[PDB]
């Protein structure tokens, strides 16, 4: 057995580590081929799940057709075509009639999407073929250790791809070439142990035998209506009449077998959120460990680095030990307990959430306006407002956001000690922030904020505000804020934490002084207002404000909810791919398979209808997800198992004809 194993999970490895790669690399892409005609977010959205559609068509294929062996052969190489064409289409689009150039990416495209699905069912099966002795102890072993091998492949790829991007846009070639690259090498290895392999080949067009007995069963059955209708198995009685008896009892094993598979796709909804709904929450929760400065986006790795760890825990020790007290510890079970730990994971999201919730601000909703006031001005200065008056001395502000109704912000008046009252013309708009900017007593001006959430990816955004009389220009770190009119503010900009340099420029600046500056250090998800100033000198001069308070919370409490999740996950997919195929008869594993893999498509279904926000808050979202959910069909799954599907000993069945 050992040297027909290995060339499956190289095989294996090489093929995941290249997907992965394409995954992050694709996405970016679409951000510049966008801007033709939206129509490229209209492309996107097929990947997400029909890379889980296909594999049906592998399944019919293989088990009908050409068998196993074959299909893995030519669904590889029109996987390496499409990613190919797809690498040299990014570079004809935009070196060299646009559509006709990116007719070649669709075409790469759908090329890509028949690799992915074909390969997945009939791979995996084609290794448990390997083993027939009686050796359920090796087979076990096998599943997991292919399963493992397919997140060592997601595990590299997330460390090399930023290294290997940006390496020349240029390295767009670089890009897609490499992850082709590799898949070359998984095809070339599999194909070289040809002389090792075990295969079997189909007998005849099963796919239409199973369709014409089912077929005539069902219309069979509606006849009768009043002569012995009541059935005792609601298909193989009316089949038989004409049917061979042995095929009845293989498509009842399989009918058996995903009748239970009815209310996992549930669970497939569950764990995507780890890729979206949480890599949300790290953006606000992101204080950083002293030692290192990891990213917001990162975090999705520890899930692939936990799974190769516990994975040898789990075969190597734990199970052996619950045997040992007596537990018994069946496929059914496993599954079972797996379900449970996943929603156990989700709960402490919640705590999680809500702790969070305690330091972030108020953004506006609705009819209502925020206002925040920044006197400027070498002198103090009174201002009048709804309810409310605010007295500010030069170079304050309002520490927090003033709160009020549109239809409530009637007038607005400014005056300064002794100087004459200046009412406010200018005009605000509903749901958003706004600054007011106050020098004199009759000069004032009036700027939307433009943030009105917490900065995406945790990203500090900053902006200058001009007081010179002369227009202003200044670069920092690669952006520029050119022509800034006297008494007025630029727009935010986002950079990554860190200490950020930036030099100015103006033609009221004499040369001798000194352009450049330097920041304080950014943490994450504030943001910050500079105002630039006069010396007597003329030289430029520095002040900062601040907008919206740093992140607090650490980003090692997402630990916890990791941990579990992906405890989760081991008990249950892994028994779930070899469960599934132990059951199968002879002549349809990879019917089943694909039968499994059906399951995580529609599992993405069901997370994208719930679509966005319809609640008050994801204290609520991140609760019912899996409570109303997950913990019912958890229970519903339990009592379906109570009709021992297990009871079927498939290896042996058949050898009674």
Request: charged share 15%; hydrophobic share 45%; aromatic share 12%.
């Amino acid at each position: 057995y050992p040297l027909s194993i290995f060339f499956i999970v190289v095989n294996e490895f090489c093929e995941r580590f290249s997907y992965y790669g394409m995954r992050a690399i694709l996405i970016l892409y679409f951000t510049n081929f966008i801007s033709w005609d939206n129509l490229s977010t209209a492309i996107y959205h097929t990947f997400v799940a029909l890379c889980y559609l296909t594999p049906i068509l592998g399944a019919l294929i293989a088990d009908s057709w050409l068998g196993k062996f074959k299909t893995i052969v030519s669904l590889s190489i029109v996987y390496t075509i499409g990613q190919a064409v797809t690498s040299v289409s990014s570079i004809n689009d935009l070196t060299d009639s646009l559509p006709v150039h990116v007719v070649l990416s669709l075409i790469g495209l759908a090329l890509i999407a028949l690799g992915t699905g074909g390969i997945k069912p009939c791979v995996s099966a084609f290794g448990g073929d390997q083993f027939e002795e009686g050796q359920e102890k090796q087979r076990n072993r096998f599943f997991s250790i292919f399963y493992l091998a397919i997140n060592a492949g997601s595990l590299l790829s997330t460390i090399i791809t930023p290294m290997l991007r940006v390496q020349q846009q240029a390295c767009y070639p670089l890009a897609f070439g490499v992850p082709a690259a590799l898949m070359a090498v998984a095809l070339i290895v599999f194909v070289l142990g040809s002389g090792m392999y075990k295969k079997f080949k189909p007998q005849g067009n099963i796919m239409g035998k199973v369709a014409k007995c089912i077929g005539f069963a069902i219309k069979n059955r509606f006849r009768h209506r009043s002569k012995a209708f009541p059935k005792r198995e609601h298909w193989l009685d009316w089949a038989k009449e004409k049917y061979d008896e042995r095929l009845i009892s293989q498509i009842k094993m399989v009918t058996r077998v995903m009748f239970l598979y009815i209310p996992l796709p549930m669970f497939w909804a569950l764990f995507d959120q780890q890729g979206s709904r949480w890599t949300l929450q790290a953006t606000t929760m992101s204080g950083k460990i002293g030692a290192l400065e990891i990213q917001p986006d990162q975090m999705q790795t520890v899930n692939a680095i936990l799974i190769v760890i516990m994975v040898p825990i789990f075969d190597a020790v734990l199970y052996p030990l619950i045997a040992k007290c007596g537990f018994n510890f069946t496929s059914l079970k496993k599954m079972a307990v797996g379900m449970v730990l996943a929603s156990m994971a989700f709960v402490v999201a919640a705590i999680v959430q809500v702790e969070i919730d305690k330091t972030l601000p108020v953004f506006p909703k609705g009819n209502e306006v925020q206002i925040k006031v920044l006197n400027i001005g070498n002198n103090t200065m009174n201002i009048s407002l709804p309810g409310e008056m605010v007295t500010l001395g030069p170079m304050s502000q309002t520490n927090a956001f003033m709160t009020f109704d549109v239809n409530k912000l009637t007038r607005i008046n400014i005056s300064s000690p002794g100087s004459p009252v200046t009412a406010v013309t200018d005009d605000f708009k509903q749901g958003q922030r706004h600054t007011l900017l106050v020098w004199a007593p009759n000069h004032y001006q009036v700027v939307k904020d433009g943030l009105n959430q917490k900065p995406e990816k945790g990203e500090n955004g900053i902006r200058f505000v001009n007081t010179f009389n002369e227009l202003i220009t200044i670069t920092m770190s690669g952006k520029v804020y050119a022509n800034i009119s006297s008494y007025n503010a630029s727009t935010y900009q986002f950079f990554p934490s860190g200490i950020k340099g930036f030099t100015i420029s103006s033609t009221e600046i004499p040369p001798q002084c000194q352009p450049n500056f330097n920041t304080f250090y950014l943490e994450f998800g504030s943001a910050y207002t500079y105002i630039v100033q006069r010396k007597n000198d003329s030289c430029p001069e520095v002040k900062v404000f601040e907008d919206i308070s740093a992140n607090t919370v650490n980003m090692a409490l997402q630990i916890p909810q990791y941990f579990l999740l992906t405890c989760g996950e081991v008990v249950f997919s892994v028994t779930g791919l070899e469960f599934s195929y132990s059951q199968a008869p002879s002549n349809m594993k990879s019917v089943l398979q694909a039968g499994w893999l059906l399951t995580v498509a529609v599992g993405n279904i069901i997370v994208l209808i719930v679509a966005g926000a319809g609640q008050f808050s994801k204290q609520w979202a991140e609760y019912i997800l899996f409570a109303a959910l997950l913990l019912v069909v958890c229970v519903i799954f339990a009592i379906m198992a109570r009709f021992y599907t297990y009871i079927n000993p498939a290896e042996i069945e058949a050898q009674f004809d």
